[PDB]
Write a protein that binds this ligand. Structure first.
Ligand SMILES: [Fe+3]
Ligand SMILES: [Fe+3]
Ligand SMILES: [Fe+3]
Ligand SMILES: [Fe+3]
Lengths: 205, 205, 205, 205
């Protein structure tokens, strides 16, 4: 008996494909260092949890909250980065405005893409500390719900899909933007994979 | 322009259907008081967010983190309780053991339902403070991942479905069990809607 | 080598001394059940941490984040309740308005005690989930800073003293007020130990 | 009526005084960028809270949880960095081992400074995400309690003094160590201001 392990997905493009918005130096360590670290961290914790389940680690030889909380940290660390990479694309394929159903929903709920961009940027910059900014598609209400995560595992909304995702941990921009997170946020719009976003949304319509 | 509002789902059974495991007094206020409060809280915050989007509330007339964080609190409060009600059933329909694919997965990953129950109960009782204990079906790895939430919005794992959900806020058991949360957890197994659980799991296989 | 253990302080009054604002039934289990549970939880975790330090628990036989986070949960659980009991007093000795330096500071920063009461009550009721509402005396700025804690260990401000403390976990009022936390908050003002508060403030002036 | 504003304390040394353990480039932006940002953020929120108190911002023109939570974030951001700067010193004045009462307490509770260093380093590296690692002096138990903070405001222990403090946000080491936080932690021991630590501890004995 055991749990299936996680696997680092391949990057959808070269590490420099996002320049000049996000330097290849950032992407390189962000993917090969940070993301890989989450896959590894999640897997080692799964191996440890398997031992708890099998009884190879008996009472007093583990602290369950440390394992469980470490798992939500690493698993989300992996899942969110995997979404992050696929949510971006080199300028041209990336950037611009959304079309199809996504654009329609955005207009109905925010008036226009231009307004949405403002509100999202504003909400992303209001995030106290490290975390993420995402646009959910609530399959229950049909609302494109904006949300900011603190760390990788706090503030998520249960079961619904992430359509737009922006990494706000400092390692996602520091080497290039230093402490100017807001400039990184502005630059990020230029590599958003709107087509992938529309494609994902379609799956829930 | 606006967001669609949330609606309190009807209870799947009478308020006393879960006795003697969970008194009708608890269920009554838990549903009509607590759950309804989340729907209302979420909706009023949505109305407020609409005003921010439309500009009826201008700069300096709102604190976005208060709205956004209040939304994750109330929206999850609503969604999780909605899952909670459907995840239980009067003794007979509720309780017992799971069958089908769910039982198979449980045996492959935990050895047996008996072991799973132990590990879940142990993990649920380790929760520091109020929150939830859930069993996820990770569509990525195929793992039935156990997790404890702190409050309604901390520790969730992105996008994956909740198969089993246990409410651990004090209002879910205090009136009947006082501070003996562990006794409430033991009693809860008797009303778990395993059929609904198998049904939900099937949807992702 | 070892760490000193914590001790449950004696209650400053009889368990019914706070009626009719907080029933003796609540106080009884709140002190003998909940508070005692924190002292015990903190001590057992300290014993476990001692074993990690001494090496009796070797690598792979513990998950440090579980121990450390369990310690902040239980230690604060103990400390905050200890402050809570001393921050209240039977009607007469408790309730009313503050005098001395505390009253003056309140007037300078909030205009009046009445205004302060309003803002504090408003802030306490805005707390999403379980936790606490406190009035700090920031020794750095001299500000009587209001704050809400989520659970027992989130949102504290480093090193400064708590002058006013209100428990907002459901077990502090459920048996008597059920889900009407706001009514409990209003009733609480009637047992606030303003003299003890003035006394504590004096120590930092 | 109003609240007193916070002030950025002057750096205790030149921005390059901590090299080669922490580059002057990091210190420069860490102090002039990050720390200053917290003082400013705290003050603007205080100004806003004053308006809520005075009534210049009426109902519906603010979201109290956003103000209150933003205050704990920024105030701690300021206080913790202020402690951080004073807790370090150029090599010579900094680094080495503690003496006096601090050393004795460390020996009684951890066996030796060497063991303490190991446990602290281990605990600091276990921190999931950004935050801090601190050594508290619990005035209640007399325990030198280790703790890791998540972000600037989560996991603190009420009212007790911080003797040792290590910043674990990525901006404290990224420019020099990139994602190798553990190497930064090892290097940090070389600039710990043990004398200041002993001095602060003395105040509570
Ligand atoms: Fe990242
Ligand atoms: Fe509930
Ligand atoms: Fe309590
Ligand atoms: Fe810092």
């Amino acid at each position: 008996i055991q749990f299936k392990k996680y696997e680092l997905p391949p990057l959808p493009y070269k590490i420099d494909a996002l320049e000049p918005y996000i330097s290849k130096d950032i992407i390189d360590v962000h993917y090969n260092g940070h993301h890989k670290g989450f896959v590894n961290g999640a897997n080692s914790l799964l191996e440890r949890l398997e031992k708890v389940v099998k009884g190879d680690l008996q009472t007093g030889q583990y602290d369950i909250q440390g394992i469980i909380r470490g798992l939500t940290f690493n698993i989300n660390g992996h899942k969110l980065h995997a979404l992050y990479w696929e949510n971006m694309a080199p300028s041209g394929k990336g950037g611009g405005k959304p079309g199809g159903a996504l654009a329609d929903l955005i207009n109905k709920q925010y008036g226009s893409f231009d307004r949405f961009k403002q509100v999202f940027t504003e909400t992303a910059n209001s995030l106290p500390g490290t975390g993420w900014a995402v646009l959910y598609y609530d399959t229950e209400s049909g609302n494109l719900q904006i949300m900011t995560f603190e760390n990788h595992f706090q503030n998520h909304i249960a079961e619904i899909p992430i359509i737009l995702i922006l990494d706000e941990f400092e390692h996602a921009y520091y080497l290039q933007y230093k402490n100017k997170r807001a400039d990184y946020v502005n630059a990020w719009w230029n590599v958003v994979n709107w087509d992938a976003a529309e494609k994902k949304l379609q799956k829930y319509l």
